[PDB]
Amino acid sequence: KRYVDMACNTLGDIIILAFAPKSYAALNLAFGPERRDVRLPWRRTRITLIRGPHIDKTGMEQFERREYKSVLTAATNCPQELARLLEAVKLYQFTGVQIKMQLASAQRVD
RNA sequence: GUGGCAACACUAUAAAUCAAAGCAAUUGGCAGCGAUAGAGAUGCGCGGUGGAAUAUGCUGUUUAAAUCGAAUUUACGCGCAAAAUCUUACCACUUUUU
Protein backbone atom coordinates (compact mmCIF):
# COMPACT_ATOMS: atom_id res chain seq x y z
CA LYS A 1 0.00 0.00 0.00
CA ARG A 2 3.11 2.18 0.44
CA TYR A 3 3.97 2.14 -3.26
CA VAL A 4 0.46 2.66 -4.60
CA ASP A 5 0.07 5.48 -2.07
CA MET A 6 3.23 7.24 -3.26
CA ALA A 7 2.14 6.62 -6.85
CA CYS A 8 -1.24 8.21 -6.24
CA ASN A 9 0.28 11.24 -4.50
CA THR A 10 2.97 11.83 -7.08
CA LEU A 11 0.58 11.64 -10.01
CA GLY A 12 -1.72 13.99 -8.12
CA ASP A 13 1.20 16.39 -7.89
CA ILE A 14 1.68 15.94 -11.66
CA ILE A 15 -1.97 16.72 -12.51
CA ILE A 16 -2.09 19.84 -10.35
CA LEU A 17 1.20 20.97 -11.86
CA ALA A 18 0.06 20.09 -15.36
CA PHE A 19 -2.88 22.46 -15.35
CA ALA A 20 -1.31 24.97 -12.94
CA PRO A 21 -1.73 28.66 -13.66
CA LYS A 22 1.76 29.60 -12.67
CA SER A 23 1.13 33.29 -13.36
CA TYR A 24 -1.99 35.43 -13.64
CA ALA A 25 -1.28 37.29 -16.80
CA ALA A 26 -3.28 35.39 -19.44
CA LEU A 27 -6.55 36.13 -17.68
CA ASN A 28 -10.95 27.75 -19.18
CA LEU A 29 -9.53 25.85 -16.16
CA ALA A 30 -11.03 22.48 -15.36
CA PHE A 31 -11.62 22.01 -11.72
CA GLY A 32 -15.20 21.17 -12.73
CA PRO A 33 -17.06 19.05 -10.15
CA GLU A 34 -16.42 15.87 -12.07
CA ARG A 35 -13.01 15.69 -10.30
CA ARG A 36 -12.42 12.98 -7.67
CA ASP A 37 -9.92 10.68 -5.98
CA VAL A 38 -12.02 7.54 -5.62
CA ARG A 39 -10.42 4.80 -3.54
CA LEU A 40 -11.42 1.22 -3.89
CA PRO A 41 -11.55 -2.17 -2.18
CA TRP A 42 -10.09 -5.35 -3.53
CA ARG A 43 -10.74 -8.80 -4.87
CA ARG A 44 -10.99 -11.09 -1.82
CA THR A 45 -9.59 -14.50 -2.74
CA ARG A 46 -7.72 -16.96 -0.51
CA ILE A 47 -5.46 -19.66 -1.99
CA THR A 48 -4.37 -22.34 0.45
CA LEU A 49 -1.59 -24.93 0.52
CA ILE A 50 -0.52 -28.20 2.03
CA ARG A 51 2.16 -27.53 4.62
CA GLY A 52 3.81 -30.92 4.44
CA PRO A 53 5.69 -32.56 1.61
CA HIS A 54 4.25 -36.03 1.66
CA ILE A 55 1.49 -37.52 3.71
CA ASP A 56 0.53 -34.70 5.90
CA LYS A 57 -3.06 -34.09 4.76
CA THR A 58 -3.71 -32.54 8.13
CA GLY A 59 -1.09 -29.95 7.28
CA MET A 60 -2.85 -26.98 5.68
CA GLU A 61 -1.89 -23.32 5.46
CA GLN A 62 -3.70 -20.36 3.87
CA PHE A 63 -2.12 -17.89 1.43
CA GLU A 64 -3.30 -14.86 -0.26
CA ARG A 65 -2.69 -12.13 -2.83
CA ARG A 66 -3.54 -8.43 -2.42
CA GLU A 67 -4.29 -5.87 -5.14
CA TYR A 68 -4.76 -2.26 -4.05
CA LYS A 69 -6.45 0.19 -6.36
CA SER A 70 -6.99 3.88 -6.85
CA VAL A 71 -8.40 5.84 -9.74
CA LEU A 72 -7.23 9.32 -10.62
CA THR A 73 -9.59 11.73 -12.33
CA ALA A 74 -9.11 14.86 -14.40
CA ALA A 75 -10.00 16.30 -17.76
CA THR A 76 -8.87 19.20 -19.91
CA ASN A 77 -9.30 21.10 -23.12
CA CYS A 78 -5.89 21.66 -24.77
CA PRO A 79 -3.61 18.84 -25.93
CA GLN A 80 -0.11 20.17 -25.21
CA GLU A 81 -0.37 19.67 -21.47
CA LEU A 82 -1.95 16.25 -22.06
CA ALA A 83 1.22 15.40 -23.91
CA ARG A 84 3.14 16.80 -20.94
CA LEU A 85 1.21 14.32 -18.82
CA LEU A 86 1.90 11.34 -21.07
CA GLU A 87 5.56 12.16 -21.34
CA ALA A 88 5.67 12.77 -17.59
CA VAL A 89 4.37 9.28 -16.93
CA LYS A 90 6.79 8.09 -19.61
CA LEU A 91 9.72 9.34 -17.55
CA TYR A 92 9.01 8.72 -13.84
CA GLN A 93 9.41 5.00 -13.22
CA PHE A 94 7.32 3.44 -10.45
CA THR A 95 8.23 0.32 -8.56
CA GLY A 96 6.14 -2.84 -8.85
CA VAL A 97 3.07 -0.79 -9.70
CA GLN A 98 0.88 -1.12 -12.79
CA ILE A 99 -0.38 1.92 -14.72
CA LYS A 100 -3.54 1.36 -16.75
CA MET A 101 -4.84 4.56 -18.28
CA GLN A 102 -8.13 5.63 -19.88
CA LEU A 103 -8.18 8.56 -22.31
CA ALA A 104 -11.66 9.20 -23.66
CA SER A 105 -11.34 12.26 -25.85
CA ALA A 106 -12.92 14.11 -28.75
CA GLN A 107 -11.62 13.57 -32.27
CA ARG A 108 -13.13 14.62 -35.59
CA VAL A 109 -14.54 12.21 -38.15
CA ASP A 110 -14.73 12.28 -41.92
C1' G B 1 34.34 -71.85 79.43
C1' U B 2 30.04 -70.21 83.19
C1' G B 3 24.07 -70.82 83.99
C1' G B 4 19.89 -74.08 83.23
C1' C B 5 14.90 -78.34 83.75
C1' A B 6 15.84 -76.53 78.94
C1' A B 7 14.57 -73.73 74.68
C1' C B 8 19.56 -71.61 74.65
C1' A B 9 21.40 -66.70 77.61
C1' C B 10 26.15 -65.12 77.38
C1' U B 11 31.62 -64.22 76.48
C1' A B 12 33.79 -64.57 71.74
C1' U B 13 36.86 -63.97 67.15
C1' A B 14 38.06 -65.02 62.83
C1' A B 15 39.14 -67.33 58.41
C1' A B 16 37.98 -66.01 53.07
C1' U B 17 36.59 -62.43 49.44
C1' C B 18 34.93 -57.60 47.64
C1' A B 19 36.02 -51.80 46.00
C1' A B 20 32.42 -50.06 47.36
C1' A B 21 28.54 -51.48 50.89
C1' G B 22 26.70 -46.62 53.11
C1' C B 23 24.69 -41.48 55.18
C1' A B 24 22.16 -36.35 54.80
C1' A B 25 19.91 -32.35 52.19
C1' U B 26 18.19 -32.09 47.82
C1' U B 27 16.66 -32.03 41.75
C1' G B 28 13.79 -34.90 38.83
C1' G B 29 9.67 -40.25 37.85
C1' C B 30 5.99 -42.37 40.47
C1' A B 31 0.50 -41.87 44.24
C1' G B 32 -2.86 -47.85 45.14
C1' C B 33 -1.59 -39.66 50.09
C1' G B 34 -5.06 -34.82 50.31
C1' A B 35 -6.64 -29.33 49.43
C1' U B 36 -7.26 -25.35 45.53
C1' A B 37 -7.96 -24.34 39.53
C1' G B 38 -9.04 -26.09 34.10
C1' A B 39 -11.01 -29.27 29.77
C1' G B 40 -19.34 -31.78 25.81
C1' A B 41 -13.63 -34.32 30.92
C1' U B 42 -17.87 -37.10 31.49
C1' G B 43 -23.19 -38.86 33.51
C1' C B 44 -26.42 -33.73 30.31
C1' G B 45 -28.17 -33.47 24.24
C1' C B 46 -27.66 -34.02 18.87
C1' G B 47 -25.91 -36.51 14.67
C1' G B 48 -22.98 -40.29 12.70
C1' U B 49 -20.41 -45.24 12.29
C1' G B 50 -20.81 -50.65 12.46
C1' G B 51 -27.20 -52.73 8.73
C1' A B 52 -28.06 -51.90 2.46
C1' A B 53 -25.89 -50.03 -2.30
C1' U B 54 -22.45 -46.79 -4.62
C1' A B 55 -18.06 -43.94 -4.42
C1' U B 56 -13.25 -44.19 -2.38
C1' G B 57 -8.58 -45.92 0.07
C1' C B 58 -5.85 -50.54 2.21
C1' U B 59 -4.67 -55.66 2.90
C1' G B 60 -4.96 -60.47 0.66
C1' U B 61 -5.55 -63.39 -3.96
C1' U B 62 -4.22 -63.98 -8.90
C1' U B 63 -1.88 -61.73 -13.33
C1' A B 64 3.19 -60.40 -17.53
C1' A B 65 2.96 -56.01 -14.66
C1' A B 66 -1.33 -54.93 -11.14
C1' U B 67 5.21 -49.45 -10.48
C1' C B 68 6.83 -47.52 -5.36
C1' G B 69 6.50 -45.62 -0.52
C1' A B 70 2.58 -44.34 3.81
C1' A B 71 1.72 -49.43 8.49
C1' U B 72 -1.26 -49.10 16.12
C1' U B 73 -2.60 -44.42 17.68
C1' U B 74 -1.09 -39.56 13.95
C1' A B 75 -1.84 -45.35 7.46
C1' C B 76 -6.36 -46.44 5.07
C1' G B 77 -10.90 -39.30 0.03
C1' C B 78 -2.46 -40.98 1.97
C1' G B 79 1.82 -38.90 -1.62
C1' C B 80 -2.49 -38.54 -6.34
C1' A B 81 -5.51 -30.48 -5.89
C1' A B 82 -7.42 -36.00 -10.31
C1' A B 83 -4.28 -42.59 -14.84
C1' A B 84 -8.64 -42.84 -21.74
C1' U B 85 -2.49 -42.73 -24.71
C1' C B 86 0.86 -39.07 -22.43
C1' U B 87 1.06 -38.41 -16.51
C1' U B 88 4.44 -43.24 -15.33
C1' A B 89 8.82 -44.96 -12.95
C1' C B 90 5.91 -51.62 -14.24
C1' C B 91 5.17 -55.36 -18.01
C1' A B 92 5.17 -57.77 -23.58
C1' C B 93 7.66 -56.69 -28.13
C1' U B 94 11.17 -53.83 -31.52
C1' U B 95 15.12 -50.55 -31.80
C1' U B 96 18.82 -47.11 -29.96
C1' U B 97 24.02 -45.00 -27.21
C1' U B 98 27.90 -45.83 -23.51
Distance CA A39, CA A70 (A): 5
Return the closest nucleotide (C1') to the Cα of A47.
B81
Q: Which nucleotides of B are covered by protein (CB under 7 A)?
A: 69-70, 74-79, 81
DSSP for residue A31: -
Burial class (CB in 10 A: 0-12, 13-18, 19+), A11: buried
User: What residues contact residue A27 under an 8 Å CB cut-off, 6+ apart?
Assistant: A21
Check if the beta carbon of residue A76 is closer than 8 Å to that of residue A19. yes
The radius of gyration computed from the CA coordinates of chain A, to the nearest angstrom, equals: 21
Determine phi and psi for A88, rounding to 5 degrees.
-65, -40
Provide the β-strand partners of residue A61: A49
Q: Is the shortest CB-to-strand distance from A45 to strand B under 7 Å?
A: no
User: A48 CA, B28 C1': separation in Å?
Assistant: 44
The resolution, in angstroms to one decimal, equals 4.2
